[PDB]
Amino acid sequence: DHHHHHHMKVTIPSGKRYYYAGMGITTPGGKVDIIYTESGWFLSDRAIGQSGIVPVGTIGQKISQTLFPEMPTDFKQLSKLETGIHITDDMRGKYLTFAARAINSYGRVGNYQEADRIWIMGLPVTQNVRLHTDADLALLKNGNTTSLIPTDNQLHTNTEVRDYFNDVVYGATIPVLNYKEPAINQTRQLIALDGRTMQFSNHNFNNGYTTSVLIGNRQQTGPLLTYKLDDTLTWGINLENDGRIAIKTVDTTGGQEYIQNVKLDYSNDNSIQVRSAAKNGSLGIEIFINGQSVYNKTVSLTRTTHNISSGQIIFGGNTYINEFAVYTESLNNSNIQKLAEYFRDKYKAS
Ligand SMILES: [Ca+2]
Ligand code: NA
Ligand code: NA
Ligand code: NA
C-alpha cells in the first residue's frame, strides 16, 4: 500500500510580483498545467487573522518575523475564472494571487497551490512618478541571491533596493533594517542612511517637481533632503533631535531658518512633501508636513543667474526612511492629500 503525489504547475505567465493601481493594468491570465482542477484569483484582507494584523509588502518569499496572509482564510475569492485581473484602487496594499486545487476521483478537494504572489502597491498617485522606493520591498543580497531581511533591528548594507516604478536597482550602499513594530504587531523596514547619501542626478528644477517622504518613528538628525540646484546653489531640509526643521540655502558665490511652529514628534511616523516649480526667475518651494503646507517661499536664481536645469535630489542624514516618491509634476492639493493619507494609514489594519 502506497500513495502517489500528482503534480500541478500553477503560474501567471509573464506576471510580475507587484503592480500599481491607477495605471490601467490588467494582469496576464493564470495557467494550470497537470484529476480535475478548480482555479481562480484571490485578494487578501487588510487584516491577517488569528484583531487582525496589517499586511506588509514583499517581492521576496519566506529569520524573518513578517506575517503574511494565509490561503484561504486571509483571502476573498475575486474570480472563479483564470483570465487576468484589472487592478482597482480598492486592491491597494493587498496581495493578489492565482491559485488552483486538485479534485480526485472521489470528489476530494486538495489544498490550493499558488502562483507567485502579487503585491498591489499602496502608492495612491502614479501620474508622473520618476522614482518610487518602498523600504518594505528591500531585500538582503548575498552574491546574486536575494532573501528577506532578518528581523533583527540591525542595519544591513548587503541589500538590494530599487526604484520600483521603473524597476532599476540602485548602485549606492543603502543600509536597511527590518524590525517588529509593537504598535502594529508586524514587521516593517527602514532605510537608515547613517550619514550616507542617495544621490539622484539630472533633475530640471525649472519644471514642476514633488518629493514625498515618509520617515519612521525614531529620533533623527541631519540633511534628510537636499536639492543641489546647480554647482553652487543648494536648498535643503535639516532635521534636529528636538523635532525642529531647519531650511538652509547655500550660495557659494545664503541663509538658514527654522520652519515656524513645527516640532516633529518622533514618537510617530511623519510625512514630509516638497513641491516646487520655477516662476518669474525664482524657484517656489512649498513643504507639507503630515498633509499641512508649513512653508511656502521662493529661492532667488539671480543674486549672477543660476541655471537649475540639471540639479540633484539627495537623501541623507541620520534618518529612517520608510518610503519616498519623486514626481515630475508639482502635484495639486488633492494629490498631496492622497499621499499624506496613504502615508498615515499605510500600516493601519482594517
Ligand atoms: Ca496536485
Ligand atoms: Na508598496
Ligand atoms: Na541580513
Ligand atoms: Na477588512
Author numbering: 2 to 35, 46 to 61, 64 to 75, 80 to 270, 275 to 324, 327 to 373
From the paper:
Type 4 pili (T4P)—important in bacterial pathogens—are filaments composed of one well-characterized major pilin, and several minor pilins whose roles are often poorly understood. Streptococcus sanguinis T4P are composed of five pilins, which makes it a good model to determine the role of each pilin subunit in detail. PilE1/PilE2 are the major pilins forming the backbone of the filament, while the three minor pilins (PilA, PilB, and PilC) form a tip-located complex promoting adhesion to various host receptors. Here, we characterize PilA and PilC, showing how they interact and how they function.
To confirm the prediction that PilC might be a modular pilin, we solved its 3D structure by X-ray crystallography. After optimizing the best diffracting crystals and using SeMet protein for phase determination, we solved a high-resolution structure at 1.45 Å. Strikingly, while bioinformatics only predicted that the C terminus of PilC corresponds to a lectin domain, our structure reveals two distinct modules. The first module adopts an Ig-like fold (PilCIg), consisting of two β-sheets packed against each other. The second module that corresponds to the lectin (PilClectin), is a β-sandwich characterized by two opposing antiparallel β-sheets of six strands, with concave and convex sides. PilClectin shows significant structural similarity to multiple carbohydrate-binding proteins, including galectins such as human Gal-7 (PDB 2 GAL). In the Gal-7 structure, the protein interacts with galactose via a carbohydrate-recognition domain (CRD) forming a patch on the concave side of the protein. Since the two proteins share good structural homology in that region, we speculate that the CRD might be on the concave side of PilClectin. When we compared our two PilC structures, we found that they are essentially identical, superposing onto each other with an rmsd of only 0.79 Å. We then purified these mutant proteins and quantified their affinity for 3′-SL using ITC, before comparing it with WT PilC. This revealed that PilCT347A and PilCK349A displayed significantly reduced affinity for 3′-SL, which was particularly pronounced for PilCK349A, with 39.3 ± 1.4% of the WT binding.
